[PDB]
């Protein structure tokens, strides 16, 4: 639905530095500031058989402020803060041209260039001294070496031109910058006096690649001149993509989902392989984390730990206690590594199978999806604790059972004896809950080994029963998949 299109071109980038000067008073001997300034430039050049018109803008950063001041006397020479560029300073050259490629520069999958370095040398500036020997600025040079292309925009008068920004590094060069007829010799670097040396333009040549993502709702019919710019793009409605994600569960499978859920999914494993733009593949993971932190579930984790810490120094009746410890068990499940099938495994599996078959179209929207699913998926779940072959099972809705392992018949529950063990003994997610398990034992009479395995939520036995095509387990896991509805 979103098609890659390569637009790699060989370009010639022409640019010139901008010089701003501010005079200090008196009779005209001193100066206040000599500094680099943003500089525009227009040109045209022949390439590939057509004349392409280009617009460039040069700017400087990291600039040093040398100084020189002959004293407080009202005629002694000096420049209060005269700049230079050296190792630290960078120069950006925003580049634009009328060619077709720059119309399709909104969404990009990749972008990188190869430009040839250049040597910029300083000119000759005759500081305007009213009388006497003429001071002479001369010399100084650097070399621009390309390092990295990014997106950018010229805030040009008539419109805002989306453009490519080339960040060139620097390298000080041989000619020792001097203030001749004056006390500054054998410096090195390019000062702001006359960075252009009278040249009409400093010139670079190279080749830049680009992989745009022009949209497509049909194979044969691909567009030109991408014009769905962020003026023409707007927030997809929250309920709208909620409905889309809910609809996506039309297609999810039964056993393949469990097979995926039995992976270790990490940051790289999930968030890689998303057909996204460059601006979102840069920080998708951090974007997801930022909104994951403030989710109701995450602040519930924080409240649990802080409440326990504060308690460390502070010193249907059953349904309420069971429900509260059920929420607590959900929190514990999320924070710790359980050895069972662990409902959040299934939640993450559904999440991956949903997001993989989507696309990023100028807005991340994995925030509000990953973090929202983390809290909404599988709203009512169940846990259990086995002890002495009398497993006590609990539901987040408040229900409770206590049934034997060898034969699945329940027993009167023991509140405050389940609570002593739920703190320390390992909790087992009940993906095969007591009701479905009783159905399975009644209809398909099972053995001690597989009974214990299903109680423990062993992936081996779960997949064995799924691949037996057991209707009970098949239907149960299908409903498990179906509550994942955001």
């Amino acid at each position: 639905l979103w098609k890659e299109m390569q637009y790699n071109r060989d370009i010639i980038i022409r640019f010139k530095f901008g010089n701003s000067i501010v005079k200090m008073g008196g009779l005209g001997y001193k100066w206040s500031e000599i500094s680099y300034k943003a500089a525009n430039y227009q040109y045209n050049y022949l390439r590939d058989g057509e004349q392409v018109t280009a617009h460039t803008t040069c700017s400087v950063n990291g600039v040093n402020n040398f100084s020189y001041n002959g004293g407080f006397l009202p005629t002694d020479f000096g420049i209060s803060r005269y700049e230079v560029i050296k190792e630290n300073s960078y120069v950006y050259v925003d580049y634009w041209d009328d060619s077709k490629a720059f119309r399709n520069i909104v969404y990009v999958r990749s972008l990188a260039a190869n430009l040839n370095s250049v040597r910029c040398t300083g000119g000759s500036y005759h500081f305007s001294l009213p009388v006497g020997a003429w001071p002479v600025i001369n010399g100084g040079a650097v070399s621009l070496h390309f390092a990295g292309v990014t997106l950018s925009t010229q805030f040009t008068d008539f419109v805002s031109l989306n453009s490519l920004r080339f960040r060139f590094s620097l390298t000080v060069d041989e000619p020792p910058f001097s203030i001749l007829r004056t006390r500054t010799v054998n410096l090195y670097g390019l000062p702001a006096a006359n960075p252009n040396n009278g040249n009409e333009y400093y010139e670079i040549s190279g080749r830049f690649s680009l992989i745009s993502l022009v949209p497509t709702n049909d194979d044969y019919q691909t567009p030109i001149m991408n014009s769905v710019t962020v003026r023409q793009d707007l927030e997809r409605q929250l309920t709208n993509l909620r409905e889309e994600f809910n609809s996506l569960s039309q297609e999810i499978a039964m056993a393949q989902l469990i097979d995926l859920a039995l992976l270790p999914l990490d940051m790289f494993s999930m968030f890689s392989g998303i057909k996204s733009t460059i601006d979102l593949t840069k920080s998708m993971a951090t974007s997801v984390m930022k909104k994951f932190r403030k989710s109701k579930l995450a602040t519930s984790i924080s409240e649990m730990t802080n409440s326990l810490s504060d308690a460390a120094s502070s010193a249907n009746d059953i349904s309420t206690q069971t429900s509260t410890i059920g929420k607590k068990l959900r929190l514990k499940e999320m924070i710790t590594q359980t050895e069972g099938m662990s409902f959040d495994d299934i939640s993450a599996a559904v999440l991956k199978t949903k997001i993989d078959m989507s696309t990023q179209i100028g807005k991340n929207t994995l925030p509000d999806i990953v973090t929202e699913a983390s809290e909404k998926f599988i709203p009512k779940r169940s846990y259990r604790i086995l002890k002495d072959d009398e497993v006590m099972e609990i539901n987040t809705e408040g229900k409770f059972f206590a049934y034997k392992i060898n034969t699945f018949d329940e027993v009167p529950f023991d509140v405050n004896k389940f609570a002593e063990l739920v703190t320390d003994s390992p909790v087992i997610s009940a993906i095969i809950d007591f009701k479905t398990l009783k159905n399975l034992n009644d209809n398909y009479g099972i053995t001690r080994t597989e009974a214990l395995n299903l109680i423990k939520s062993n992936p081996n036995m779960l997949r064995n029963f799924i691949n037996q095509n057991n209707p009970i387990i098949r239907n149960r896991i299908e409903q498990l998949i179906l509550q994942c509805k955001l």
Binding site: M267, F292, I335, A348
Partner: peptide, 25 residues
């Protein structure tokens, strides 16, 4: 597969320096 939620929560500290990037920039 649940490992990713734990990874998000554990590694969430870096969002602080990411928003530091955003505000300093």
């Amino acid at each position: 597969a649940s490992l990713i939620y734990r990874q998000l929560l554990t590694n969430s500290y870096s969002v602080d320096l990411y928003d530091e990037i955003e505000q300093i920039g």
